[PDB]
Every structure is written in structure tokens, then in C-alpha cells.
Amino acid sequence: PTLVSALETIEPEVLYAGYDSSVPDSTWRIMTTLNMLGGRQVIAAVKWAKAIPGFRNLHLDDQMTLLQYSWMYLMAFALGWRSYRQSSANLLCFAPDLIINEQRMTLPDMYDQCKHMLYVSSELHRLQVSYEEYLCMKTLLLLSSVPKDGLKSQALFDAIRMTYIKELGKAIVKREGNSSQNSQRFYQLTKLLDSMHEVVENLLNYCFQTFLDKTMSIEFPEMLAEIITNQIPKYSNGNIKKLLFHQ
Amino acid sequence: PTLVSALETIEPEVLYAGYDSSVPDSTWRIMTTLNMLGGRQVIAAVKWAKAIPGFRNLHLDDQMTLLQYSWMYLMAFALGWRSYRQSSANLLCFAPDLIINEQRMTLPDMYDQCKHMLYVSSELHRLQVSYEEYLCMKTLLLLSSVPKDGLKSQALFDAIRMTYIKELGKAIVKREGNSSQNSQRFYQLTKLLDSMHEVVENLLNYCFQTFLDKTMSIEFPEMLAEIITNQIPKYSNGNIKKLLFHQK
Numbered sequence: 001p002t003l004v005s006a007l008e009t010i011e012p013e014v015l016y017a018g019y020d021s022s023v024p025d026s027t028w029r030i031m032t033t034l035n036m037l038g039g040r041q042v043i044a045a046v047k048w049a050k051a052i053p054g055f056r057n058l059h060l061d062d063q064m065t066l067l068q069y070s071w072m073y074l075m076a077f078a079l080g081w082r083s084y085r086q087s088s089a090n091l092l093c094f095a096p097d098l099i100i101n102e103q104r105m106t107l108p109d110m111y112d113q114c115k116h117m118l119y120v121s122s123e124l125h126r127l128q129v130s131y132e133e134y135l136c137m138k139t140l141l142l143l144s145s146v147p148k149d150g151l152k153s154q155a156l157f158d159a160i161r162m163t164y165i166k167e168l169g170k171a172i173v174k175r176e177g178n179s180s181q182n183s184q185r186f187y188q189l190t191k192l193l194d195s196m197h198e199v200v201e202n203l204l205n206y207c208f209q210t211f212l213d214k215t216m217s218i219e220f221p222e223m224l225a226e227i228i229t230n231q232i233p234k235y236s237n238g239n240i241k242k243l244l245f246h247q
Numbered sequence: 248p249t250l251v252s253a254l255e256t257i258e259p260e261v262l263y264a265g266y267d268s269s270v271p272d273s274t275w276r277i278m279t280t281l282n283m284l285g286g287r288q289v290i291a292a293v294k295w296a297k298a299i300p301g302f303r304n305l306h307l308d309d310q311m312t313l314l315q316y317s318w319m320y321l322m323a324f325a326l327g328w329r330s331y332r333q334s335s336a337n338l339l340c341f342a343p344d345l346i347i348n349e350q351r352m353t354l355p356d357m358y359d360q361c362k363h364m365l366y367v368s369s370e371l372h373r374l375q376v377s378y379e380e381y382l383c384m385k386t387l388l389l390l391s392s393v394p395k396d397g398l399k400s401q402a403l404f405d406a407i408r409m410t411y412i413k414e415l416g417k418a419i420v421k422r423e424g425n426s427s428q429n430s431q432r433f434y435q436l437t438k439l440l441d442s443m444h445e446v447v448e449n450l451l452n453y454c455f456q457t458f459l460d461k462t463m464s465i466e467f468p469e470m471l472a473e474i475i476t477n478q479i480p481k482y483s484n485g486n487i488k489k490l491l492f493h494q495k
């Protein structure tokens with residue numbers, strides 16, 4: 001079987017919010033439900049990441065580092081895709097029973113962040129992104145940030161990253177053809193992945209409740225998910241090589 | 248020692264939010280902090296209620312019922328007092344490091360509820376409520392709702408309620424004097440306690456995530472705080488005698 005179809009099978013079922021819409025709107029209840037959903041999304045993200053080809057073959061300290069940097073990248077990109085595939089970048093589709101209109105979030109500080117999240121769906125809409133392109137792109141967001149000093153299994157990471165870069169290229173070829181059109185498209189899609197660093201920096205700034213200097217050296221996925229969930233870690237930019245396709 | 252000074256000693260130390268105000272405002276972070284604070288306030292409310300004279304002498308099924316009805320009454324009244332004593336009913340003073348301005352909560356659904364909470368502080372400000380009056384009044388809010396069929400230790404409850412009514416009367420006398428002025432004041436303070444039923448009905452409607460018909464008969468009473476916190480229970484009005492000093 002193809003590497004895209006392996007990424008397609010491991011992609012989880014959509015989570016439902018468990019939210020009553022027939023009752024009158026309570027912003028307290030929405031935010032409570034979002035927090036419960038976000039915790040469940042981190043369980044699903046870690047489970048997904050461990051099923052990615054190549055990821056298991058890395059060192060466990062490398063595996064737990066990548067997920068610590070990349071959890072918000074994955075959730076916010078997937079949010080972009082769902083919002084794109086449902087409403088066409090008008091509504092924030094957190095779950096099928098928890099769709100938030102932008103005009104509902106009237107507060108400037110909340111509105112500002114909804115724009116950052118809607119930017120991802122807008123660009124997915126603008127570039128008319130394929131489901132196979134999304135799958136490769138999402139895998140590259142797991143592999144988008146590295147420690148400054150470096151990983152333990154650094155040479156294997158590079159080879160894992162470059163094969164998923166090639167797999168994005170393969171997903172571009174299936175659209176139509178022409179070397180000019182493909183190169184330009186590969187530019188556009190990598191420019192979006194680059195811009196996710198600036199998107200996530202805002203979203204993390206908004207919600208983080210613990211600042212750490214370096215990554216925590218965790219071994220086990222049951223521990224990891226609880227560490228991310230309870231304290232919502234922001235790791236300092238000085239010790240992260242944020243990988244970019246373009247300067 | 249006097250019954251007011253017993254209520255004064257058992258009154259807990261003010262909880263701090265653990266919130267950084269020097270950073271720019273995130274409404275996500277405020278609401279996260281409020282949820283953590285609200286859980287801690289329920290631990291304190293149950294601990295307080297068990298230390299009230301008379302309350303321990305009731306049946307455990309009566310004790311667990313009163314706290315199930317009255318938890319939001321206690322927290323929202325205390326919120327009113329802190330907001331009164333700190334900002335003079337302009338700001339919602341959830342904790343000393345988590346003071347929320349009404350103009351900050353621009354959303355209509357959030358604004359509407361902030362007005363309900365600010366009403367309590369406004370009335371405490373208007374009536375110039377003493378700290379001893381607040382303490383008796385807050386004790387009566389624990390004893391403000393009863394099941395329709397009734398409590399097990401119902402005659403003892405009535406005597407516990409009526410002594411705390413008399414203790415409010417004693418706290419009124421310490422202000423100045425005159426039988427006319429006291430009676431009128433006792434009217435005004437009981438009218439506030441009556442209006443807390445309508446306040447709490449709104450606040451519960453806004454935040455409840457489990458609707459139950461009757462009160463839960465809990466088996467390990469220490470579990471109560473966790474039951475209130477995790478599910479945020481609203482109990483149906485049909486099976487509650489909401490006690491009022493004056494009917495409507």
C-alpha cells in the first residue's frame with residue numbers, strides 16, 4: 001500500500017463536542033466544552049503521531065519533543081481543514097456539533113484569535129487543497145520544529161522529513177500536471193506551512209499557563225498527554241530551530 | 248463566645264486567582280482561571296457549611312441536600328460582598344487578583360450575567376450592609392431552599408433557621424436603634440435574600456451541565472464537592488420549596 005493511503009487510514013474519526021444547541025447560548029458553556037474537546041484532541045494527536053511511518057523509528061526523547069513543540073500546529077491545521085470542508089472558511093468548525101460564527105465572538109481579544117484560526121481555513125480555501133495534500137502537509141507540521149542543539153536521531157529525522165516532502169510533491173502531481181504549475185503550487189503550500197509558526201505563536205501566547213526554557217524529557221504517551229493538557233506548555237523560541245522552507 | 252463571632256472565625260481566608268494582570272488580556276485565560284477558582288470555592292463552601300452551628304446536628308441526607316441547592320447562592324452572595332467592599336459595586340471582584348470590569352465583558356450573554364452578579368453588590372452597597380449582617384444573611388442562604396415533601400430533621404431545621412433570623416435582628420440593633428428603623432431594615436435585608444432566588448436561577452441556567460429532578464442522596468458525604476464541581480447540578484423547581492420571607 002502507498003504511503004498516502006497509510007496516512008489516510010491512521011487519520012482518526014472526527015470528535016464530537018457533546019454540546020446542546022437547543023438551549024440558549026452560554027459563552028461559559030462553549031469555553032468549558034472547548035477545553036474538554038481540546039484535551040481529547042491531544043490524546044488523538046499523540047495516538048496519531050505514534051502511528052506515522054518513520055516516527056516510531058526515532059528515539060523516544062525525539063518523539064516526545066516533536067509532539068511538545070507541534071501539538072497546537074496539528075490541532076489548528078485540522079481545525080482549518082474542517083472549517084474549509086464544511087463552511088468554506090466562514091465558520092470555525094471545532095466539531096460537527098460546535099460550529100462558532102465569527103460575529104458571535106464580538107470581544108476584540110477573542111475575535112483577533114478567531115481571525116488567526118480562520119486564516120488557516122481561508123488559505124486552504126484559496127489554494128483549493130486536496131485531502132492527500134492536507135495529509136502530507138499535516139505530517140510535515142509534526143516535523144516543523146527542532147531543538148537548537150539538535151535531536152539524538154537527527155540524520156533519520158532529516159530522511160523522514162524529506163520523504164514526506166517528496167510525498168507532498170506526489171500529491172501535487174495528481175491534480176493536473178505541468179512542471180511550472182507544480183513548482184508554483186509547492187511554493188504556495190510550503191509558504192502556508194511557514195506561516196503556521198506565526199499563527200501558533202499567537203494561539204499559544206493566548207492560552208499558555210506555563211513557560212519552559214527547554215523541552216521536558218518524557219518517555220510515555222500517557223504522561224505526555226497529561227503534561228500538555230494540564231499546564232499548556234509554551235517552550236522558549238531561543239532554543240527552537242523553527243524549520244522554514246523560505247527565509 | 249457569641250454566635251456571630253463563631254460565624255466570624257469559621258469565615259475562610261479570601262482565595263487568590265493566581266492570574267497575571269501585567270500581560271495583555273486573554274478571555275480564554277480569565278475563564279480558565281475562573282473555573283479553577285469556582286472549584287476551590289465549592290471546597291471552601293462545604294467546609295464552611297459543616298462548621299456552621301446547628302448544621303452538623305441535622306441528618307446527613309438533609310446536610311447534603313441543603314448544600315446541593317444552596318452552593319451558587321453562597322458563592323454569588325460572597326462575590327457581591329467582595330465586589331462591594333473592594334470596588335463599591337462597579338467591578339466584579341472574583342478574587343483580589345481577578346477583578347473584571349463590566350465594560351470588558353462586551354458580549355450580551357456574558358454582560359447579562361455580570362449585571363445579575365452586580366445587582367447583589369449594588370444592593371449591599373445601597374443598604375450599607377454590616378459585616379455581621381452579611382455573615383447572618385449568608386448563613387440564611389444555606390437554609391433558603393427545602394425539598395417539597397420535606398426534610399428528615401425538619402423541626403430542628405426550623406429552629407436552626409429561626410435562631411439565625413434572630414441573630415440577623417441582633418446584628419441590625421448594633422447599627423443605631425429605633426424599633427421602626429430596625430423593622431424596616433429587617434424588611435429590606437429579607438427582600439434582598441428573597442431576590443437571590445431569581446439571581447441564582449439565572450446564573451445556574453447559564454452554567455449548569457446536568458439537570459436532575461430530585462436531590463442526589465450521596466453515600467460518602469466527602470464526595471459532595473467533587474459531585475457539584477464535575478457536573479454543576481441544577482435541581483428542578485417543582486420539587487423545591489424556595490423559602491421566602493414575603494410571597495409574590
Ligand SMILES: CN(C)c1ccc([C@H]2C[C@@]3(C)[C@@H](CC[C@@]3(O)C#CC(C)(C)C)[C@@H]3CCC4=CC(=O)CCC4=C32)cc1
Nearest residue numbers: 034035037038039075076079094110113203207229275
Ligand atoms: C486542553 N488544551 C491544551 C486545549 C484546550 C482548548 C483548546 C482550544 C481553545 C484555544 C486554545 C484554541 C486556540 C486559542 C484558544 O485559547 C481559543 C479560543 C477561542 C475560540 C477564541 C475562544 C484552540 C484552537 C485549536 C483547537 C482545535 C479544536 O478542534 C478544538 C480545541 C482547539 C482550541 C486547545 C487545547
Ligand SMILES: CN(C)c1ccc([C@H]2C[C@@]3(C)[C@@H](CC[C@@]3(O)C#CC(C)(C)C)[C@@H]3CCC4=CC(=O)CCC4=C32)cc1
Nearest residue numbers: 028281282284285286322323326341357360450454476
Ligand atoms: C465548576 N464550578 C464549581 C464553578 C466554576 C466557575 C464558577 C464561576 C463562573 C460562573 C458559574 C459564575 C456564574 C455564571 C458563570 O458561568 C460566569 C461567568 C462570567 C463572569 C459571565 C464569565 C460564578 C459566580 C460566582 C463565582 C464567585 C467566585 O468567587 C468565583 C467563581 C464564580 C463563578 C462557579 C462554579
